[PDB]
Structures are given as C-alpha cells and as structure tokens.
DNA sequence: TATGCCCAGCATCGTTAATCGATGTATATATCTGACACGTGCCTGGAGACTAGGGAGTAATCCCCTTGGCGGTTAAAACGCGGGGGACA
C-alpha cells in the first residue's frame, strides 16, 4: 500500500502468508511435454460493422429498427 | 145557365247589377321587452414600487443501491388425455 512502507508491508505479508501457501512453477514433467505458444490477432472493422459500432452508441438507427428493445439493451450495448 | 173566349194578377224560373261584409295583402306608425354600452358614484382588491431575506439554484463530492453476469438445483409451467358436470338452449 504505502509507497515507502511497502517493504514494511511485505515484511509482514511474505513472512506470514507463505506457510499456508504453496508456489511452484511447471519446471517439472514439462520437459517431455511438447511446447506452449499463443498469438494475438489485430482485426480491423468491416462494412455492416461500423454501422453498428457507430449508430449504436446513439439512438438514431438503433431506434428505427428494433426501437422498442433499444431501451433495455442501451447500457448493455455500451460497456458490457 | 153552362161553355168557351177577352182582360188583369201574383208566383214560378232564370239572369244582371249594386251593396254590406268577410278574406287576403301590403305599408308606414305606435307599443313591448330585453337589453348591451356609457356615465354616474364609490371600495379597494389589485397594481405599482421598493426592500429584505431565505429558498432554491448550482456546483462538487460520496457511496449506496440498483443492475448484471453467471450457473444448480428443483419447483414450476406446460401438455396432454379423459371424462364428467356445468353451460346453454
């Protein structure tokens, strides 16, 4: 928490938490097992996509088509 | 003397014209009532003007409450089948 008490803080947290804790990496049985890997994907927007990336953040053509439902999903659509 | 013949005589029918009166239609006049606008008079309940103060506006922060997402059971909704008893004539 505190910037300069943090050492004081983990002096209390590291010494106490460990017992009832176990931290151990794979570095085991993974030597046989074939390798792990992950790739990201940058996909840019489409045609009908912007329409509903742009119009949805307002109630322009989101209210023209399915306007009755617009109301409940309006926040649903925003950040979730 | 009785019976056909001459000379009036009012009522029968119809038609013309003047007259009192009823009906229909204007036409300018004298009431009837029902006013709505104005001036008469007066009251003050509003308008007009100024003040003083505290409500309410707004802005800045907080933190609680409302919405959300998710997944497990476990009751509830859903369905149908069947036949009885209430609706309806």
Q: Tell me how the structure was determined.
A: cryo-EM
Cβ < 7 Å from strand B, A residues 38-77: 72, 75-76
Alpha carbon distance A60, A54 (integer Å): 10
CA distance A58 to A21: 50
Give the resolution in Å. Answer: 10.0
Q: Say if CB A44 and CB A50 are below 8 A apart.
A: no
In whole angstroms, give the CA distance from residue A25 to residue A45: 39
How many CB atoms neighbour CB A74 within 10 A? 15
Check: CB of residue A59 under 8 Å from CB of residue A68. Answer: no
Q: Which residues are CB-neighbours of A52 under 8 A, at least 6 positions away?
A: A62
Classified as helix, coil or strand, A7 is: helix
Q: Is the CB of A80 under 7 A from strand B?
A: yes
């Amino acid at each position: 928490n505190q910037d300069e008490e943090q050492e004081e803080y983990i002096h209390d947290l590291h010494r106490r938490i460990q017992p009832f804790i176990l931290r151990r990496l794979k570095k085991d049985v993974e030597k046989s097992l074939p390798s792990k890997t992950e790739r990201i994907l940058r996909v840019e927007l489409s045609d009908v996509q912007t329409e509903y990336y742009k119009n949805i953040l307002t109630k322009n053509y989101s209210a023209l088509t399915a306007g009755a439902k617009g109301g409940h999903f309006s926040l649903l659509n925003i950040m979730n």
